[PDB]
Every structure is written in C-alpha cells, then in structure tokens.
Amino acid sequence: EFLEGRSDMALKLVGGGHLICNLKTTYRSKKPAKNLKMPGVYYVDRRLERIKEADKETYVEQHEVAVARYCDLPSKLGHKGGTGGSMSELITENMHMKLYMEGTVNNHHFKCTSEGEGKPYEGTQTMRIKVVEGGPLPFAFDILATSFSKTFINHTQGIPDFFKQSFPEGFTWERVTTYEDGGVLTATQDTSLQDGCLIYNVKIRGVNFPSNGPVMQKKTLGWEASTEMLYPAD
Amino acid sequence: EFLEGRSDMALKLVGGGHLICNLKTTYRSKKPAKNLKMPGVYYVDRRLERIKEADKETYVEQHEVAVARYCDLPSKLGHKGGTGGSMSELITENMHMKLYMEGTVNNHHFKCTSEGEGKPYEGTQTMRIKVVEGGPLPFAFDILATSFSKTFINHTQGIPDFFKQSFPEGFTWERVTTYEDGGVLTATQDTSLQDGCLIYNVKIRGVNFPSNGPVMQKKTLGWEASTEMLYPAD
Amino acid sequence: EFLEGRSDMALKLVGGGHLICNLKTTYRSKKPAKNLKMPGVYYVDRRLERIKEADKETYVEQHEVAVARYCDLPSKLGHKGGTGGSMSELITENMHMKLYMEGTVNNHHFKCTSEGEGKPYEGTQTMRIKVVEGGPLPFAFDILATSFSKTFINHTQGIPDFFKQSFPEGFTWERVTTYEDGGVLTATQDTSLQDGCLIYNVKIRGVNFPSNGPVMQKKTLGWEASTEMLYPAD
Amino acid sequence: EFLEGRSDMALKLVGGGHLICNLKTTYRSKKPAKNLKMPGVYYVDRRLERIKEADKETYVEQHEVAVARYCDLPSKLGHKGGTGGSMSELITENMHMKLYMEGTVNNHHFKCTSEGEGKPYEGTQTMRIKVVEGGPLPFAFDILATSFSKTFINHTQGIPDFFKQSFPEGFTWERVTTYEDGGVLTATQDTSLQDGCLIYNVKIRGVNFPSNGPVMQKKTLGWEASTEMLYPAD
Ligand SMILES: [Mg+2]
C-alpha cells in the first residue's frame, strides 16, 4: 500500500510563455502496512520559489510552502471523507535536513549537497544548495528543483499524514517528469531519520532534453505554483 | 492570446483503485484580443458527480461545482497576484443551456443532446443528458463527462473571467485527454449565445482504448475532484 | 480479433533536422473472426512521397510504396512464423479508389476529396487530392499525408493479407499520431467495396500543435521512409 | 553532431498478446566532429533472443543479430542516400566485451556483470549475464534486454558506421523506454576500448511500472524482432 501523485507544473520562460511538464510520483513507505492510517484522495498546493542565486547557478537557495487539503467544495453526493486525523511524534515542529544528490542529465554528470530547515506542520522549508562536481551546469537548474521534501506538507484538514507517520523507518519516492518538448527526468529518493535530522538521498537521470530548447539553453525563470493530486493504491 | 489548461483527473474503478488521465486544453476566444482583460496564472477546483443514471447509461444527469482562485499561499517573492476585476453583463446569474454532441469512440458512432441550468457566478450547474443514437454505448459514460461549460466558474478574488467576458461572440475549446492505459479522447467544442441561452456544440473522437481494460468493460465509477491550472499564451 | 500497428515517422524540417511523431493504429475487421487467416508479428516498409503540389497546398498528389515482410534474419530459437499464404479475390490487380475526408486541426475546419489508382499486390498507389473547403490550410499538409490505404500492401513471403481478406464487408482503422513537440492527431476511417471501387471515409481531429512550431508555420518538407510493426490481439 | 534513434518493440506475454513500448535513444560520440563520417537516415532490423536462463533469471545468455540498411524501395524522387562507406581499423572481426551494470527498478536496487563475444561486421553477438546483487529480481528480466551493444551492427549497403568510427575515444548512449501500461525505464551507458576489449558501463533507472501488471508479475516471454530508425541531428 502506497500513495501515487500526479502534477502538471509550469516552467516560466525568458520572453513570456511556459513549458509544461507532467509528474507521475510513487510514494512508498518503509513502515509496515498494518500500522499506517491511509488517507483518501487529496490535493497539495505548493509554491516553489528561487530565493537566491550565485555562481552561474552552482549555488541556489530554494523556499517551498506546501499545503494539503480535501475538496472544500460541497458535494451533492456523500463523500464527506473527510475522515482524517494523524499524529506523528518523531517529527518536531522545527526540523533540520541534509541532502546528497548524484545523477546525469543528457550525458553530463554532476553532484549536489544541501542543508536546510523548515516547519513541517506549518508547511514551509528552505534549502541551501551546492553544486559540487560538474558545475557550471549546462542545463537550467530549475529541472532539479522538485528533487530536493514530503515531510513538510502541512496536513491541516486532519487528513492523515502518510509521510510523517512513516518515521523512523522512513519513506522513498520515485518520479518521472515528462516535459512536453521531449525531455524526461526520472529520480529516485530515500528519506530516513538519524539523530533527529532528515537525510535525503537522491539520484537523478534525465534524458532527451532538446539541445536547442529552453532547458539546455537556460532560458527559464522558475516555476509557477502547482497542485499535486495524491491517492492510495495496492 | 488564449488560455491553455492542464489537469490530471482520477477515474474511480470497480474494486477500488484508479485510472489516471491527462487533460491538455486550449481555450480560444471569439471576442478580439484588445477587448479582453487577460488573467494571470490561476487554478480551478472542480467536483463533477453523476446524480442520476437510467437505461444502461443512455440517460445521465450531471452536477458540477467549479471555483477559480489564485494561489492563496504567501509568496517569499513579490508575485502579489492578485490584479483582477472583471465584469461580464450578458451572463445573468441564472442561465439555461442546450447541447448537441456527435463523435466516435473506438469505431462506435453515437449522438447526444442535453439541456441544463446553473448559477455561473456561484460556480454550479446541472446537465440532463440523453443518448439519442447508438445506445447502449459499449463504453463507460464517464469518459464523456468532461465534454459537456466554462462559463459556470465562480471567479472570486477578482480574477478576470475569460469565458464570460467573451460574450456575445462566444468561445471554443479543444482538448486531448490522455489515459495512462492507452486511450486518447480529443474533443472540439463551440460555445455561443442565442436569445439568452447558452448553446454547446461538441465533437468527440476517441481511439485506442484497450478492449479488455476498465473503460470498455465499464468497470468505472465516476470521477474524483480535480484541479485545472489555467494559463495565458500567444 | 484484430491487428495493431506502431510506427515512428520523421518529418523533414526546413533547415535540416527532423520532428518525430508516433503512430498508434488499431485495424479492425468487418468480416467474421472464423473466416480470417490471422498473420503473426510482421513489418511494413513504406516510402511516402509528394509527387506534386499546386495552389498553396490545395492540390497534392501522393505516391506510396508499401512492402510487408517477416524478419529475414536468422533466429537462434525456433520462431519460424514463418507460416503464411493468403489469396484475396474481390481485389483485382488493378484497383481504383475514391475517398472523402472531413475534420479539424487546431480549430480550423476543412474537407478533402481524392481519387487514385494502384497495384495492391505490387504494393504501389497514387492519390490525387483536392482541398474543397477551408483552404488555404494554415498548417503543413504533411500532417494529413498518412490519412489518405491499407489494401495496397505487397504481402510477400506468404504473409496472410488481413486487409484483402476482409472483402466484401470491408475494414476500419483508427489511429493516434503523437508529435514530440505536442501536437496530437487522431483519425478514424472506414473502408468498403462497392462496384469494384474501394471507398474510403476518413475523419480527422488534431489538436495542440504549437503555434510557433513547424507544423503551423509550414516549415516542413515531407516524411522520411518508415517501418510499421503489425501484430494481432483480441 | 550525434545520432538519435527511435523504435517500437513488442513484448511477448504469457497467454499470447503483447505490451508495446517506445524507445527514444541519443547516441553521442567522444571522437571530435570533423573526423566522423555521418550517416544519413537509416534503419536497423534486430532480433534479440534469450538463449539460456537459469536460477530464476539470475543467469541469462543473450544473442543479437543487427543488420542496418537504407530504404531498399524505389523513390519517385531524387533521394538515393546512397553514399555510404566507412572503415574502422581498431575493431577486429572477433571482439570481446565486458560489462558492468547498476540501477533501480521500482525502488528495487541491483547490479549485473556480463561478458561476451561477437562479430561486429557480421552483426552478431552474445552476452552471458550474471545478476550479482539483489537477485532474484522481482521484475521481468526482459526490460533490461536492450541495455547490455552498438558496435556489433552489420552496416551493409555502405552506411557510414557511426559507432565503429568513434574508436578509440568511444561513444555514450542514453535512452528512455516507455511502456504503454505506464512503466518508464531510462538508461545511460558508456562504451570504451581498452587493450582490445570493449568495456561497457550501464546505469538503469526504471519507475512507475504497474504492480499488478506483466513486468512486475514476471508474465513475459521475450521480445519480437524490431526496427529502430536512426537519424543525425545538430
Ligand atoms: Mg493539476
């Protein structure tokens, strides 16, 4: 039993306009099935923003605000669900995170580290990111943004927090992002808890980004906000 | 200058679980560009529900609640939104609609008519739908649900209503719904205003739906709510 | 029981280079299952060439050579298939065709008629095509090329000709062509035999072709040759 | 300047039938552009067959025969490649190969080694493959078949051999395979020549393969033969 997510995000392009991409994510728990209180269908509203940038994109500081909900709207049918209610004690309201990243984008190899802090229950976080190997990146940094934190989703409407419940075992995610110009970037990730710090271990592998298109030429200017739909399966 | 939308909807399956599909929509105005007050990026939360169904799905009555917004969430940067403010006079707060649909799904041809009423500014509406030809359909009616009214979106927060402003000329849409099991359903549509009634004319052409998959075997059970991301281009 | 095909075609672009698209076709028979001699997996090599063009693309003349085969190459295992042998009699070795087409591409409506002749068993044909409505098209004619004749495939090596067997009842196809820049074009089609003439009925519904991309700007120069992979299911 | 490829392969299923997937590959040379003799558009017919299998798939011995061509078919126009002609001294007619592979498929990690030999100019090769970590795999070995050899393509008809020309520098490839049931498997690979042996280094990352589908349940039975379409870009 896991959660699958789906999003369509929009990339802002130099000169106006946008490039769309599609996110198919599968969220897997390391905690055993019997001990989880599974949600029903729900949505997470994010806004992901580039705060600071230095050195041809080899240093980037990212902020994110994530908030989960159920459909607020009244329903002529009986899907109040609703339901809800989850509590997660290992996660304090002030948490620190450390991350390591490694992968390839169009045959170009690179490594990244980051450290950050945020407020899980409030739905906010920040990430200070270093490109350590294979900088300057020849591709728009934006495409890695979604790969740097499911724990910091503010589940307010009682909705069961599938990510915060998982600890200490942890959770993984694995995602395939599909740009409409042809590019494809898959990423696998491990979230674990050691001494009260959240440890992220990612692996990027992207291919087929058009060479004379916005991603490789770096004509991008951050993302718009987005809605992820999340739903349980098998 | 027009609006493109992107949504991912979830289809409910007999036995739990879901089949996801992707909606790429282009909304075009018949009113001239200069006379339109274009919105910025925004989102529409819908909930579409089958009220009544009779005769192996040859009569179906649908209700929808659509509410548009901007990102409520605070932004570290200065994308205040909120701009806004649009007024559209031809659309009263009680509207009636009449519809004709014709198209093919996996070589099987069919025709539909419908009539309904709803409250545009409140975001609510109802549709009473008849299969007048080629019923009973060998496919789940659900896949047509999204093809029957952009005017009944409650634009509050002072978001410019691209759909209402358009009147009297009217507007069209054209969409490609892409199921993850392989099916593909495109639709072209014309909206227009004649004697204070909203007139819909649709055309469907769906192909490649697996014969032994949920859609053809009719093992589906309505949609979950969804979020559409609407954005201006060219 | 029917045949599915898959092709990837390449579009020649003004200035060198190519735009790839994907063809998913389902070919369905009108003749009863028991009286057909089903093929195995096999391949069709085509080369489609614009012989003539006049009037801003409102007259186009097409030649096609199609030849189906099985893998000639030796197999370490014993896949023979192999098999083969079909004869089809309603189809003479000189056939004439008449075709009608109607559909939409990015909200622009149009109709086409054509007449042509070829040698089915030899795998050749020509088509003389008139745009009778909604010319001049604001889009590259190329994208319609693949919608104007399955009967004229030279099945050598003894492969059972699934298309020639169908007569007199006839057969349909229905296809989704998916460009990598985003455009999508589906087409459903009906074949039949009336008075020794082959009668084609096509319908087009294409959407989402980027306005500032090759297809809408007409910066194309025909297709490259292609291989279609044909295989039976249900 | 490099080569892109496109294929559609068919996977054989327990109980008959097939699951199709799409291959987008980009082939990059490590040898400098001025010294390469680029091909034109062309095709490769392969047949990949599992010879032996032992220990729940932890040992697989693979055979491949690859033969490249242009379009044998006559053209009503001036397009005859034909050109062709390439010579590659460093590659003998009996070559040896050693490979290391590492990656993840649906959150499951694994490593593979293989060694093999074949006749590059004749277009044949064999691979003896050992699963060295994380066996037995919970997924159909098939989805890995295409990741173990571009040097052993028999370029007849005189097509300039882009893979053999690269030596000694070597070449990389990177590919995205997209199943129609939802799975996605990208792979990056490094080829090189050291002491007269071909050295392969692969990395796999497959995701979003359906849990209740053929690949994960191991209901597969090898590939059908296939055609890849190769074309130059940049
Ligand atoms: Mg969405």
Author numbering:
A (entry chain A), B (entry chain G), C (entry chain B), D (entry chain F): 0 to 147, 151 to 236
The authors write:
In an effort to address this limitation, we undertook a systematic effort to produce bright and stable circularly permutated variants of two naturally occurring proteins, mCherry, a monomeric variant of the Discosoma sp. coral protein DsRed, and mKate, a monomeric variant of the anemone Entacmaea quadricolor protein eqFP578. Here we report the systematic evaluation of circular permutation sites in mCherry and mKate, and the development of highly efficient circularly permutated red fluorescent proteins (cp-RFPs). We performed a similar circular permutation analysis of the monomeric far-red protein mKate, which derives from the sea anemone Entacmaea quadricolor and shares structural similarities with mCherry.
Finally, crystallization and structural analysis of cp-mKate154-153 and cp-mKate168-167 revealed the expected tertiary structure previously reported for mKate, with only slight variations around the permutation point. A. Cartoon presentation of mKate (pH 7.0), cp-mKate154-153 and cp-mKate168-167. Future studies will be directed at determining the structural basis for fluorescence variation in circular permutants of mKate.
